[PDB]
Each structure stands twice: as C-alpha cells, then as structure tokens.
C-alpha cells in the first residue's frame, strides 16, 4: 500500500488496492426431502421418537403458513405500493432494490406448474444436474437426501403397529442428528417471511459450495479467487423460498458472479482547507471523496465508503451502485492548476473543525483554536499542533484529540508520501463549477 498526501488541496489517496466487482447472479435450486413423515403415527406414551416426530411434523405445518406471508410482502418489495415515507426510514432502495427484485422474478417463474415438475424430474437418478428454465435461463439443481434415506427404509420398520417405544436407543438419538438441518431451514424462512439476508451453513454446506462454485462457466482465475474467499461469497448471497411441494422443500439461493478480478483501485479522502484571513473567511472543499475502480478503461465512482468492503488488499464493490466517470478525473489528484478536466470543488463561509480517518494515515482540521493534540498509549500528550491540515501517520501517533473526543488509528503498515505544493491562499473561482 502507498499513501500520498496532497497539501495543495489537503487530501490523501491510497493507491495499492486490487479489486473484485460483482456483475451478475448465478442461481441454484435446492430440494430437501422429508419423506412420508406425515403418515406414520406414534401413539404410546411420551418417548424419544414421540417428541421428535411431533417436532418434525410441526415444522411442515409452519412452513406452509409462511408461504402465505411471502406472497403478501413481495408486492411491497417490487413497487412502492404503500411504502410511504414517515420517519425512521429503513432507506430501502440503496442497492438491494435492483437485486432483490431480479431474484424474486426468477422465483415466480420457478414456482409455476410444470417447472417444479421439470426440476424434480431431472433429479430422479442423481443428486446433481444442470437444467434449463422456460425462458432459456439455465439453473443448477441439487438434491439432498439424508432424511428420506433414513425415514423411509430404517425408521418405518421399527415403528410398526404404532408401537413407538423400543429398547434400541441408537435410532432415537440418530433421528435427532438427521433432523437438525431441516429444523434450521424452516426456522430461518419463518422469521424473515421467506427472504433470508445471507447464506448460512444450513442452506448450503461447505461441501455443497465447492461443487456449486467449480461448476459455473467462468475463467480459471475467477474460480480460484472465489474458492479462497468463501467467507465473503457466503456473505454476499441471499436465498429465496419457493414453496412446499408435497413432502419436500424447494428453495433457491443466489450466488454472486465476479466479473472483474484484478485492476487497480484507490481511495480519496479530503479535509477542509482554508489558510485564509479573517476577512473573506471562506474556502474550498473536495466533494469528490469515495472509491475509484477501473473495469474497461472507464472508472466507476462510489461516493461513500459504506458501499464497498475490504479483506486486506481486495475490495468487494458492486457494479449496480456506481456512476461512470471519465478516466481523466484522476488528474485532480495530480494537480489543481490543470484545467483539462472541470474539477469538482465546493465552498463555504463557515469552516468547521473536522478529522478524517485515512485507511493508513489520518487527517485533522482544527480552526477555532480549540485544544487539538496528538495522543499515544505510553505517552498521554505528545504535542499541540498548529491550525489544521497536518497529516499524521499511525506510525508516529496512536490517538488524536478534538473536543475531548479521541480517535484511534489503525496498525496497518505501508509507505507514506507527501507532495509539496502551495495551498489555496485566497478564495478563487477558476474551477468552482459545482457546489
């Protein structure tokens, strides 16, 4: 990592990030099996089989009920029917609105008749088979058959004539083992009305994630990247519920597609910088902070940091929440004297004190003379800085103090550079096009 301080505009950039961007969605359709658990009956006292058989059957009744609630909440997620504004906003529509809607529309196509018939018919002999849908889209279909393999053959024979209390206790404990995955699946869909927020170890176990990531049609680099980041692959995909068709549960999980795997990216963060006199006590501000990433010779701009993650060097952004910017916009970081690109800047007559945390360094602005001191761990107070826009590295300091509020600094080690230049002496209007 490399960070360069720009005293000309009191901003910094870190220019050593690789990146991955999500481009599309790879869908996967699962199908559990419970078998004919609804027919056999336990009717002799309380036993271990008694308390588990009733537990399993109760899950099936509940899961049929939540299907009548998903159908009601899908009308509110696809169009602003009665969303209203009011207050305490959940701020839906930021990124997910264009993602959940696409996923739901696939579910409607699947949950029709003669479609689940095809999915189930294609898996009659094997536990893995790729199949196409009505509208050309191809899906991967997986069948998991532990309970049906256990309830059918070596549970019914034990439970005869409704005599459901046997000296054999191995079966009683064993039934609890195979039942655990099913109970977790139904409970998750029940609490979220069918739309789980992220993949869990019960919708798609690890052995079923490697087989679902090495079967996609992709490059040989994308596969090797996604196998080393299972944590963030799991954390960026959601599942949907299709329904309860017979004695089985059918649901689909959306997996992300990383269309770009290696390309430089950088962060820009700015701080107010006046260096003005008491008269005309106003100055400039860079409102161009955020992320930058290259995909096809045209940078994508993310206005705020919350839209992208970080796992060391990699940056897990999304392509649906970025705005296309001409690649000449990198010139602003080089210099402001250049007039080739109209460089964004905003002014203001009320300069406030503010501190910006850099991923490697730190930025401080301190104008009204309040005690703004650098701090550390072994030494409480090191020195009192003058005015503001004094970039401080975490190698030299540990904390910064402003209005009796401390800020901690990260321990990441990397190269630091400072670029000498003349700050804006007085208020200028060569480039102040926006505001």
């Amino acid at each position: 990592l490399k960070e360069s301080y720009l005293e000309e505009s009191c901003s910094t950039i870190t220019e050593g990030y690789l990146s991955v961007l999500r481009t599309g969605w790879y869908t996967n359709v699962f199908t559990l099996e419970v078998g004919d658990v609804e027919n056999l009956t336990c009717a002799d006292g309380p036993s271990l089989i008694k308390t588990e058989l009733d537990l399993t059957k109760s899950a099936l009744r509940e899961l049929r009920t939540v299907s009548a609630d998903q159908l009601a909440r899908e009308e509110q997620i696809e169009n602003p029917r009665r969303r209203r504004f009011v207050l305490g906003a959940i701020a839906l529509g930021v990124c997910t609105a264009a993602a959940v809607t696409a996923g739901v529309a696939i579910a409607k196509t699947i949950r029709l008749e003669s479609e689940v018939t095809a999915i189930k018919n294609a898996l009659k002999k094997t536990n893995e088979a790729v199949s196409t849908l009505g509208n050309g889209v191809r899906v991967l279909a997986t069948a998991v058959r532990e309970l049906k393999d256990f309830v059918s053959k070596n549970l019914t024979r034990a439970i005869n004539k409704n005599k459901c209390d046997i000296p054999d206790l191995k079966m009683a404990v064993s039934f609890s083992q195979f039942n655990r995955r099913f109970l977790n699946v139904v409970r998750q869909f029940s609490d979220n009305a069918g739309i789980t927020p992220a993949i869990s170890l019960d919708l798609m176990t690890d052995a079923e994630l490697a087989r679902a990531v090495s079967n996609m049609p992709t490059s040989a680099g994308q596969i090797k990247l996604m196998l080393e980041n299972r944590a963030m692959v799991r954390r960026k995909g959601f599942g949907i519920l299709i329904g309860v068709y017979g004695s089985s549960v059918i649901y689909m999980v959306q997996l992300p597609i990383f269309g770009v795997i290696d390309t430089p990216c950088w962060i820009v963060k700015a701080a107010p910088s006046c260096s003005e006199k008491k008269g005309n006590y106003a100055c400039l501000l860079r409102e161009d902070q955020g992320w930058y990433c290259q995909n096809a010779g045209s940078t994508v701009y993310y206005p705020n940091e919350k839209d992208c993650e970080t796992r060391g060097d990699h940056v897990f952004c999304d392509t649906a929440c970025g705005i296309n910017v001409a690649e000449q916009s990198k010139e602003c970081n080089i210099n402001i004297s250049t007039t080739n690109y109209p460089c964004k800047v905003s002014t203001g007559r009320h300069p406030i004190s503010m501190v910006a945390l850099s991923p490697l360094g730190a930025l401080v602005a301190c104008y009204k003379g309040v005690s703004c001191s650098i701090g550390s761990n072994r030494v409480g107070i090191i020195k009192q800085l003058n005015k503001g826009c004094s970039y401080i590295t975490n190698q030299d300091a540990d904390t910064v103090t402003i209005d009796n509020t401390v800020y901690q600094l990260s321990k990441v080690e990397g190269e630091q550079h400072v670029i000498k230049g003349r700050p804006v002496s007085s208020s200028f209007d060569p480039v102040k096009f926006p505001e």
Epitope: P217, A220, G221, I257, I261, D262, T263, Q294
Partner: antibody
C-alpha cells in the same frame, strides 16, 4: 487506434533461452488481461500463456508448463515471455493478444497483434 | 480431456451458401461456454468475425452468421465471393485445458 507491436524474434540453437516482448499503446494497459498465442508454420493456432491485470493469477499451457515465464510491467506498457530449454517442435510465430469477455461465459481475443517468428534448429 | 474438432477443408462456388461446423464436447461447449470465429488471411494475423455465438462486430459485411446449440455450432456464409479465401477457426473454453482452438478449416472458392 489500438496497436500492438512484437519484438525479439530470432534463431536460437536448441537448449537455449530467449525473451520475446510486446509493447502496447492506445488503451489503458493496466485494466486488461493479456495472452500469448502461437502458430506453427502452416498449422493451427494454439494458446500458450495468460496473465491477469496485476500479475496475480497466471495460467500456462500444459505442453509448455515449467519451461516458460510470462511477466508484466504496467509502468512501461509491455509484457514479456522468457523461454527456457527450447526444443525443435517449439518453432512458431508468436502473437500477443488482448483479452475480451462479457463477464461469465464468453472469452475471446479481439485486438490481435502483428507477430514475431522464432526458429529453433540445431 | 477434451478438444474441439473441425473439418479440414470445405470447397464451394461463388454465389452459394457455405456451412462450417464446429463440434465440441461435454466439457467445452456442454458446460455453457462460447464459440467464436476468427478469419486469418494467408498473409496476416487473425481478426474477430463472430463473438458471443451470434454477434457481429463493426466491419463484418452482414453476410456471416452463426449459432450454437447443444455441443455443436455452425458458421453460415451467404453470397460467397472471390476474396473470402482464407482459413477459419472456431474457439471455446475448457474446464481443464483453459483456452482451446479448433483444428482450422480452409475455404476454397471454385471460380
């Protein structure tokens, strides 16, 4: 306006080494994966190597694994292909081609270069 | 593991229609990959003809077309003429062999 130029071809005795080069111009070099494609004289095309845009993931053809070396330098806008233990059946014309993809299931080489020739004989 | 098979040569006459078939396998085209076509004139480097299994880049004279279905793809030329005399290749991707190229066919005009 995209333009690729190859250089470094020549004649080398078997069991030697050579460093082919390819210098690009007219597009942002540090955003595209680049390839090396060879063609024997009078034969069909064949893929040889590949490298991502930051020298992170490198793929080699099975026939030449462990003997070649692909490298990049984003500052000078060029990529190199160091060869070792050259054999008689390795003479061909070498191309450097940019990579194009739609994201999931399409991959092709749109801007093919001009080419350089390498002869291996005893 | 897998390889793409292409006929050695196909001969035709001016004014007719020519079909070139690119036969894949279970791991090349069966896994939903692409087929792309390159034309190599006898003296220069190849150029892109068909990408995305049906599309046409700018400069293609609106008479070349192709399609993919199952594990086989074909290339169609309507209104054959004299200067369409070159070698044609079909490309794809493979699970274990990475990028793969077809055998390469030579088109002959009988005029």
């Amino acid at each position: 306006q995209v333009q690729l130029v190859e250089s470094g071809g020549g004649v080398v005795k078997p069991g030697g080494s050579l460093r082919v080069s390819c210098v690009v111009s007219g597009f942002t070099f540090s955003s595209y994966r680049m390839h090396w494609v060879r063609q024997a004289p009078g034969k069909g095309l064949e893929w040889v190597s590949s490298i991502t845009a930051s020298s992170s993931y490198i793929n080699y053809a099975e026939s030449v694994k462990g003997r070649f070396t692909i490298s990049r330098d984003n500052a000078k806008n060029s990529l190199y292909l160091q060869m070792n233990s050259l054999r008689a059946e390795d003479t061909a014309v070498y191309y450097c081609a940019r990579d194009e993809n739609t994201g999931i299931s399409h991959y092709w080489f749109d801007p093919w270069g001009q080419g350089t020739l390498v002869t291996v004989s005893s | 593991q897998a390889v793409v098979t292409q006929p050695p040569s196909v001969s035709g006459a001016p004014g007719q229609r020519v079909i070139i078939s690119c036969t894949g396998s279970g791991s090349n085209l069966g896994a939903d990959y692409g087929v792309h076509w390159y034309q190599q004139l006898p003296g220069t480097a190849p150029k892109l003809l068909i990408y995305g299994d049906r599309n046409r880049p700018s400069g293609v004279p609106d008479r070349f077309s192709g399609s993919k279905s199952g594990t086989s793809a074909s290339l169609a030329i309507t209104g054959l003429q004299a200067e369409d005399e070159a070698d044609y290749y079909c490309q794809s991707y493979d699970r274990s062999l990475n990028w793969v190229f077809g055998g390469g066919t030579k088109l002959t005009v009988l005029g």
